[PDB]
Swiss-Prot record:
Signal peptide limits: none
Function per UniProt: Negative regulator of innate antiviral response. Blocks IRF3-dependent cytokine production such as IFNA, IFNB and TNF. Interacts with IRF3 and inhibits IRF3 recruitment to type I IFN promoter sequences while also reducing nuclear levels of the coactivators EP300 and CREBBP.
Subunit structure, interactors included: Interacts with IRF3; the interaction inhibits IRF3 binding to its DNA consensus sequence.
Gene: ILRUN
GO annotation terms (biological process): innate immune response; macroautophagy; negative regulation of defense response to virus; negative regulation of DNA binding; negative regulation of protein localization to nucleus; negative regulation of tumor necrosis factor production; negative regulation of type I interferon production
Tissue: Expressed in lung (at protein level).
Full protein: residues contained: 71 to 180 of 298
A GO term from the CC aspect: cytoplasm
Keywords: Cytoplasm, Immunity, Innate immunity, Nucleus, Phosphoprotein
Protein name: Protein ILRUN
Length: 108
């Protein structure tokens, strides 16, 4: 059975937030199992496109309607500008599911 995931909110690094160049930072998202059954074992959040700032973090097997805070350790690009990365949940078998979530940086 295919799992579900909905984006709750950006816990850090909002759509409108500026970080300096080459600066280390943690990116945290709040997500939920918006499905009828628990997530299977061995699920993870994976990098899937756009700019990269490390491509996978394990996430716990959430019960239906449960919330989780997922954190990824990143580093802002060396030059100024607007950058965007995509992430998406993935099962132990390699199947992606859920909402695509974003990291959007304005380096100044």
């Amino acid at each position: 059975s295919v799992p579900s995931m909905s984006f709750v909110e950006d816990v850090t690094i909002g759509e409108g937030e500026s970080i300096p160049p080459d600066t280390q930072f943690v990116k945290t998202w709040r997500i939920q199992n918006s499905g009828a059954e628990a997530w299977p074992p061995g699920v993870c959040l994976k990098y899937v496109g756009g700019d990269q700032f490390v491509n996978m973090v394990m996430v716990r097997s959430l019960e239906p309607q449960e919330i989780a805070d997922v954190s990824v350790q990143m580093c802002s690009p060396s030059r100024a500008g607007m950058y965007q990365g995509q992430w998406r949940m993935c099962t132990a078998t390699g199947l992606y599911y859920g909402d695509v979530i974003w990291v959007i940086l304005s380096v100044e």
